[PDB]
Design a protein around this ligand. Structure first.
Ligand SMILES: CCCc1nc2c(C)cccc2n1Cc1ccc2c(c1)COc1ccccc1/C2=C(\C)c1noc(=O)[nH]1
Lengths: 255, 10
């Protein structure tokens, strides 16, 4: 138990090191409790006004690439801090990151979301949900269920301590395709899961079944990533020559 | 080669 608390604290410490924009920082921005106000993008005119941050919907989605590549870098830093991670076979670390990063990006995306919109570029902007919903199909339908997931995930009131371990658990998923040595992965995960269980019991003592809800949220995130991947397949079927950051080419390769 | 693998070794 005590060692499980020591591991929880170590993970929160690294998450703090690795991720500049914490959930706590983000919620402070979203509730005006902070530091300069985000610029609001609610229509085409405010969008072109805020550009210092192809057809519009492709422009908006392709501009997420800069952030996603930074996030991968952050997530890699955080993964390396998880005890046991760097001692795993190197190709298995790559595998874990390859199939993990988007789950973690959507996890952190929820932290930047409320029912009305999403923070962008380190909180310097706020894109509204209605604006995103007005985009041409299939783009306009895509984010809606992301907001839905975020609103329910945020209702659980996890903090950064909680999230750090939740994230560690996800990265140490033994079932990613083509992992060469699964057992040491699972042994790490099993211990993380115990740290998470205790973390949730001490930190959310009135919250019935939180541990199990969180397991289900990991399944929801796989589903969300499956959908994210199919949005890009659908769009590649007509946007033949669409630039893609080389880091992300590695991640999307084979999917 | 692999960009992830470089970020892992850094
Ligand atoms: C990065 C994932 C979270 C996210 N944040 C968004 C924000 C903040 C606004 C609008 C859409 C957003 N999304 C969804 C999103 C953003 C970009 C891309 C996708 C999906 C997947 O589908 C695409 C379809 C056509 C063109 C680009 C893309 C996306 C790509 C290449 C991408 N950009 O960052 C990625 O990780 N993937």
């Amino acid at each position: 138990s005590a060692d499980l608390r020591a591991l929880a604290k170590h993970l929160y410490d690294s998450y703090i090191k690795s991720f500049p924009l914490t959930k706590a920082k983000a919620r402070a921005i979203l509730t005006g409790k902070t530091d300069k106000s985000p610029f609001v993008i609610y229509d085409m005119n405010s969008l072109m006004m805020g550009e210092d941050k192809k057809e519009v919907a492709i422009r908006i989605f392709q501009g997420c690439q800069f952030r996603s590549v930074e996030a991968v870098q952050e997530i890699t830093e955080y993964a390396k801090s998880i005890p046991g991670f760097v001692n795993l076979d190197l190709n298995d670390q790559v595998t874990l990151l390859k199939y993990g990063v988007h789950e973690i990006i959507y996890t952190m995306l929820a932290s930047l979301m409320n029912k009305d919109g999403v923070l962008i570029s380190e909180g310097q902007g706020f894109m509204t949900r209605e604006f995103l919903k007005s985009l041409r199909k299939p783009f306009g339908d895509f984010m809606e269920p992301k907001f839905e997931f975020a609103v329910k995930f945020n209702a659980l009131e996890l903090d950064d301590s909680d999230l750090a371990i939740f994230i560690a658990v996800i990265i140490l998923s033994g079932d990613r395709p083509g992992l060469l040595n699964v057992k040491p992965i699972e042994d790490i995960q099993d211990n993380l899961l115990q740290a998470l269980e205790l973390q949730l019991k001490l930190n959310h003592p009135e919250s019935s079944q939180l541990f199990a809800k969180l397991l289900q949220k990991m399944t929801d995130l796989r589903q969300i990533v499956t959908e994210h991947v199919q949005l890009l397949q659908v769009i590649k079927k007509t946007e033949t020559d669409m630039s893609l950051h080389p880091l992300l080419q590695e991640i999307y390769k084979d999917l | 080669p692999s960009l992830l693998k470089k970020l892992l070794l850094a």
